[PDB]
Design a protein around this nucleic acid. Structure first.
Ligand code: MG
Lengths: 434, 88, 148, 321, 49
RNA sequence: UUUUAAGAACUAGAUACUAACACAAAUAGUAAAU
């Protein structure tokens, strides 16, 4: 009972029912002509019909252009049928889910079983006393349809299910997850800048532990406000979702809770946004975020999640004040938007702007406060409220690139006990890129 | 809730022959339409995007960096110095 | 029906005075001003439709229709009008586009947005619908003031 | 909640506030920080009175000791010459219940009072006008003005609140007793009902350091900005440094007296004067670390020119030693 | 000399975690008492009992 | 009738204790392991 309760969560069951059937809401939402389809009319599904097994009801009513010939009910792969027994216009699907077991792993007997009984029963809700059943064993991934038949559907179903059972992601969510539990997995770059909108989520600043006095003597753990850091590398408007420690009040270990509230924020942000401002990808260095993100990213098959293949330096976000100045002032959690690049889109493209930016983050990662002084050594040219980095001239930006660059190389050779003079180019470019 | 207007990539061409959508990272790669060049141009694939518009330029300047460096500035490393080189 | 009067008055402009955003007495007036300003933005987008995402215009108008009617009738809750007005106020300031987006983020999170240059709310479905389109008005404005 | 205030004396106003050109008294209020090597007093000059109940508190005046101001538990506040002069300037009235604490405007024109009636008032020191009243359910304990501008009020209900509400500070558990600023603007030390100190940067909620090892009802900061002095209930004085290492030091300690209270240091840091329940002032040689003098004056709380100190206490009289 | 500080310190504590914990708890109680008192004392200096 | 703290400043780290904080990611007070 433990391992299962993992395997399904955030109502992964219900979500499965939506992904499958709703995705059919599309596929046969748009097939009007060839089957003589007026319109695709489905009943808004009460949230519990997915996991309630008492009794079922007609799902998606097909209301024909003209008229339809209902043969005697057969299976999807029960073949030879004379349609003209009846005629209807309105129809429906019954599409159902069950996790089978070594006694009953044969659906069809279940398909026609449930189908028949339901259809011939009162409580079962039907707009037409004709229809179709499509079941699935999640356990052995099987599926079927025992319906009445007017012509043309059969292969539409067949092939369409080939797709579904091989695609509609929720299933791929299981087959990932089941393999988690089982621990079976069969053995044996610059594109960041392409047109579609690419976002950076990095969560190391989300839950910040803070060490404090233990009544007697011990080391006390706590936390102080975080926020979720996301940006597109291109157009430089920062999305900070403020994390106000109130959030964590009473509950649990906040590792899991961190990851799940990060996911739920990122999702909510996405949903709320318009189709034009939505991303086509998401890129995160922390892979502990995979599952929470994904599981809340079932809802948008359009978007495609992609991890890092490569070593990355995003944890220094807070050490550059003004944003952190904002983090420490928040009375109640909220979004704030910012500007990443100061103004780097005039004198450059965002391209080497980002190269310099990563390098800045780096020398902020290794030696830190030396870099902070390097920046603000001469404050005698002053940063506006809108900028973050010290405003410069060409030369200043330039040489500071050189110097900040120099740190990790030198400190490197010294500190990691392998020489800087014996280096090969490609490892230099490596640490520089990562 | 899902926007019903914009099709999931994998439904674009149903036949299992079409092109492979690997549901983990949700990325079509080859394009879904390999048969009929659509009368009106139609998703042309993911790969059809990657070269386009803002990354080529980068590829060029980086070529100029390699070959210049044998001919000492570094694209990723010091950008603007090189950059204004490639300008000149 | 004073709301039927304010909507017919040609003495009200689209300009938002930030000092009125949280006023209880000025609620009916500010509500109409927000209605008038949104129409004005949709008007300029219309006038240059071919130049800025013409395929998103119709959907944006439809999502904003119910909000506009409410603004015209002064049916928005206090906290909601306050947040919307704040976003629109900053939007009227070219060099304050970032403060508008920041305010927008609060509103979308369910928090009250107060003028930044100068606690909580609840969000519904149809309400979530117009809050999303507001972001489109912001992106259009940034493009408009940038391309002329 | 109504309002009624009165004016003391017909002196009125070149056109000057009473507070303003002390100038006249022997010496100079503008005065350099160290008057000279310091002295301890034997002779008491003024009764003051007016109050029929022991003064809650006594303060002086922003800049130099031009005026003196007292808090009465009869719901009254009075201003005084502070030069031993008979006249008490203008009376203030407007609290329901006994006034617990006060603070002055760094510039010196505004004045703040906190009382057990759950209200806090901002006053015009030149008219006695109740300028503004600040709400909140909790009774408000010690309140300070920012040395440059927000109110900082310590509450019985854990929190400390900055007011224009700007910033709440929830970290403290139990009542808050006193708030100082170790370095102006940047940091302050709050001492709380829970036996701990919380140090913070300004306007930022989280606390920089936590110190706990009986209680600290009153804490004061040296004129050099180098030491802190708390009158722990446990009958001792604990010395702390405002400079960076907030570590209490063994070398300086004071236990010649038994006990809320004020501890003050003679300008030039030569002496420390504690006021205690028994009513005897304890004067210690800060440098040599020894009770140098002691008085049994009063039949005592706050103790504040090198020629004198001013005390108050539960007999309701302000005395000058 | 540091190990000798260690042992030399060790021998001289006879109790165990519990007793020491008590010593603390009790003293904390005493401070609570004294505090509550001087509360009442200063309230008496305002006359309200 | 009581009473003497050698006083002040500077500085560094070294041994310790600790902390559900951080290295396809997960453990607790009936039982533990070639
Ligand atoms: Mg046990």
């Amino acid at each position: 009972k433990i391992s299962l309760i993992q395997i399904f969560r955030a109502h992964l069951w219900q979500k499965i029912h939506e992904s499958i059937v709703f995705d059919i809401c599309q596929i046969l939402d748009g097939e009007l002509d060839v089957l003589q389809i007026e319109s695709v009319t489905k009943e808004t599904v009460h949230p519990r019909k997915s996991y309630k097994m008492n009794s079922s009801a007609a799902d998606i009513t097909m209301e024909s252009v003209h008229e339809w010939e209902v043969s005697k009910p057969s299976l999807l792969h029960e073949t030879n049928d004379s349609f003209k027994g009846l005629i209807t216009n309105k129809m429906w699907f019954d599409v159902q889910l069950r996790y089978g077991d070594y006694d009953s792993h044969d659906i069809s007997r279940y398909v026609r079983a449930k189908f028949l009984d339901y259809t011939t029963d009162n409580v079962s809700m039907y707009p037409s006393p004709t229809g179709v059943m499509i079941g699935i064993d999640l356990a052995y991934n099987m599926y079927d349809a025992y319906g009445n038949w007017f012509n043309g559907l059969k292969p539409l179903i067949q092939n369409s299910m080939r797709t579904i059972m091989k695609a509609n992601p929720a299933l791929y969510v299981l087959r990932e997850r089941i393999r988690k539990g089982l621990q079976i997995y069969q053995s044996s770059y610059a594109e960041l800048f392409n047109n579609d909108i690419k976002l950076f989520v990095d969560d190391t600043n989300v839950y910040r532990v803070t060490v404090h006095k233990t009544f007697e003597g011990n080391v006390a753990t706590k936390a102080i406000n975080g926020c979720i850091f996301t940006l597109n590398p291109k157009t430089g408007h920062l999305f900070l979702k403020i994390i106000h420690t109130s959030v964590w009040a009473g509950q649990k270990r906040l590792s899991q809770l961190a990851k799940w509230k990060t996911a739920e924020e990122v999702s909510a942000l996405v949903r709320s946004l318009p189709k034009e401002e939505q991303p086509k990808q998401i890129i995160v260095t922390r892979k502990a975020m995979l599952d929470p993100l994904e599981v809340h990213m079932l809802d948008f098959p359009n978007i495609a999640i992609r991890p890092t293949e490569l070593r990355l330096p995003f944890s220094a976000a807070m050490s550059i004040d003004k944003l952190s100045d904002v983090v420490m002032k928040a009375t109640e959690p909220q979004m704030v938007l910012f500007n990443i690049y100061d103004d780097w889109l005039d004198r450059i493209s965002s391209y080497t702007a980002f190269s310099r930016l990563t390098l800045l983050l780096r020398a902020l990662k290794t030696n830190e406060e030396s870099a902070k002084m390097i920046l603000l050594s001469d404050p005698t040219i002053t940063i506006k409220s809108y900028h973050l980095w010290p405003s410069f001239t060409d030369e200043q930006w330039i040489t500071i690139e050189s110097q900040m660059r120099d740190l990790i190389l030198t400190e490197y050779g010294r500190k990691y006990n392998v020489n800087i003079s014996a280096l090969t180019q490609t490892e230099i470019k490596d640490i520089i890129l990562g | 809730t899902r926007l019903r207007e914009d099709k999931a990539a994998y439904l674009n061409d149903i036949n299992s022959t079409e092109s492979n959508y690997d549901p983990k990272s949700r990325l079509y790669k080859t394009e879904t339409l390999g048969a009929v060049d659509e009368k009106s141009k139609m998703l042309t694939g993911e790969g059809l995007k990657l070269n386009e518009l803002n990354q080529f330029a980068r590829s060029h300047a980086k070529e100029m960096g390699i070959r210049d460096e044998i001919e000492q500035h570094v694209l990723v490393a010091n950008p603007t110095k090189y950059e204004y080189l490639k300008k000149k | 029906r004073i709301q039927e009067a304010i909507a017919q008055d040609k003495t009200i402009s689209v300009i938002i005075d930030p000092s009125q955003i949280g006023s209880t007495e000025g609620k009916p007036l500010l509500s109409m001003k927000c209605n008038l300003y949104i129409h004005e933005i949709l008007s300029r987008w219309k006038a240059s439709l071919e130049a800025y995402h013409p395929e998103l215009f119709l959907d944006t108008k439809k999502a904003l229709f119910p909000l506009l009617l409410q603004l015209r009738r002064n049916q928005l809750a206090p906290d909601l009008l306050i947040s919307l007005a704040t976003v629109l106020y900053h939007l009227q300031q070219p060099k304050e586009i970032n403060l508008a987006v920041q305010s927008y983020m609060k509103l979308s999170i369910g928090n009250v947005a107060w003028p930044i240059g100068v606690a909580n709310i609840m969000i519904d479905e149809r309400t979530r619908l117009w809050i999303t389109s507001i972001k489109r008005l912001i992106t259009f404005e940034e493009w408009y003031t940038s391309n002329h | 909640s109504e309002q009624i205030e009165v004016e003391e004396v017909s002196h009125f106003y070149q056109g000057r506030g009473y507070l303003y050109p002390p100038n006249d008294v022997d010496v100079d209020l503008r005065e350099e920080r160290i008057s000279f090597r310091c002295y301890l007093p034997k002779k008491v000059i003024r009764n003051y009175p007016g109050h029929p109940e022991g003064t809650t508190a006594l303060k002086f005046l922003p800049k130099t000791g031009h005026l003196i101001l007292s808090g009465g538990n009869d719901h009254t506040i009075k201003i005084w010459d502070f030069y031993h002069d008979y006249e008490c300037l203008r009376d203030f009235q407007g609290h329901n219940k006994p006034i617990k604490a006060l603070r002055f405007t760094e510039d010196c024109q505004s004045f703040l009072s906190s009382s057990f009636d759950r209200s806090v008032k901002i006053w015009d020191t030149e008219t006695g006008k109740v300028k503004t009243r600040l709400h909140l359910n909790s009774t408000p304990a010690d309140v300070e003005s920012r040395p440059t501008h927000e109110f900082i009020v310590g509450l019985s209900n854990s929190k400390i609140l900055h007011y224009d509400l700007v910033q709440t500070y929830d970290h403290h558990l139990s009542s808050i007793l006193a708030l100082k600023y170790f370095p102006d603007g940047s940091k302050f030390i709050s001492s709380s009902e829970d036996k701990t100190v919380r140090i913070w940067e300004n306007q930022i909620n989280v606390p920089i350091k936590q110190i706990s090892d009986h209680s600290m009802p009153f804490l004061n900061v040296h004129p050099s900005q180098n030491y802190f002095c708390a009158q722990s209930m446990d009958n001792r004085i604990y010395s702390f440094s405002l400079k960076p290492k907030y570590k209490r030091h063994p070398k300086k300690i004071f236990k010649g007296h038994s006990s809320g209270i004020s501890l003050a240091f003679s300008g030039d840091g030569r002496y420390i004067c504690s006021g205690d329940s028994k009513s005897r002032l304890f004067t210690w040689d800060w440098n040599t670390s020894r009770l140098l003098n002691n008085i049994k004056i009063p039949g005592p709380i706050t103790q504040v020119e090198t020629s004198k100190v001013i005390c108050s206490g539960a007999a309701g009289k302000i005395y000058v030693c | 000399k540091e190990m000798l500080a260690e042992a030399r310190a060790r021998l001289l504590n006879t109790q165990g975690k519990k007793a020491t914990r008590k010593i603390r708890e009790r003293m904390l109680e005493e401070s609570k008492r004294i505090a509550e008192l001087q509360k009442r004392r200063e309230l008496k200096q305002a006359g309200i009992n």
